Amino acid sequence: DIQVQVNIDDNGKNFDYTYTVTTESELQKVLNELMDYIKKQGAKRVRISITARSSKEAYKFLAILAKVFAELGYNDINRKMTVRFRGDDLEALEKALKEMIRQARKFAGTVTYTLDGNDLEITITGVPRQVLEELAKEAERLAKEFNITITITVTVEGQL
């Protein structure tokens, strides 16, 4: 139902906790576990993605994420979202890519994208939470339009 990768790097200590929480009641638990950990041991660098399937879900998740890093006292924050489109007609896939990169760049946004046979990935950097959210509605209406599969991972790394 919902993917979670998490990375702590410390030089000498590293960790790649990787989850699938299905309820998302779960999700708060595991987020919570992690935090009690860093309050203790204290990490140098953390990164956390949470994968979604809906524009609405995307909203929840960076918010949830924001709360986390915020509680963590991590102000040197670094966002990112990687939209994933899936569909057989490679035409409409591209049509989406164009339109998607457009809007990402209508703001100060830097994209990378890869298309590897009917799977098109589009990463997106250098924007506020406010943009990402608005860029994800756009991701979702695009999916709906040409009836392609969408996914929206919401990364957010941060050091301190």
Author numbering: 3 to 162
Question: Can you provide the manuscript's text about this entry?
Answer:
Here, we explore the viability of such a mechanism by inserting one de novo designed alpha beta protein into another such that the two beta sheets are combined into one. The backbone geometry at the junctions between the original domains is regularized, and the sequence at the newly formed interface is optimized to stabilize the single integrated domain structure. Crystal structures of two such proteins demonstrate that complex beta sheet structures can be designed with considerable accuracy using this approach and provide a proof-of-concept for the hypothesis that complex beta topologies in natural proteins may have evolved from simpler beta sheet structures in a similar manner. Our success in designing larger beta sheet domains by recombining smaller independently folded beta sheet proteins suggests a similar mechanism could have played a role in the evolution of naturally occurring complex beta sheet proteins.
A first extended sheet protein was created by inserting a designed ferredoxin domain into a beta turn of the designed TOP7 protein to create a half-barrel structure, with the two sheets fused into a single seven strand sheet flanked by four helices. The CD spectra show both alpha and beta structures. The most similar SCOP domains had weak TM-align scores (0.54 and 0.51), and the sheets in these matched structures have different connectivities than those of the designs, suggesting that the two designed proteins have novel folds. The beta strand connectivity is quite different in the designs than in these closest structural matches.
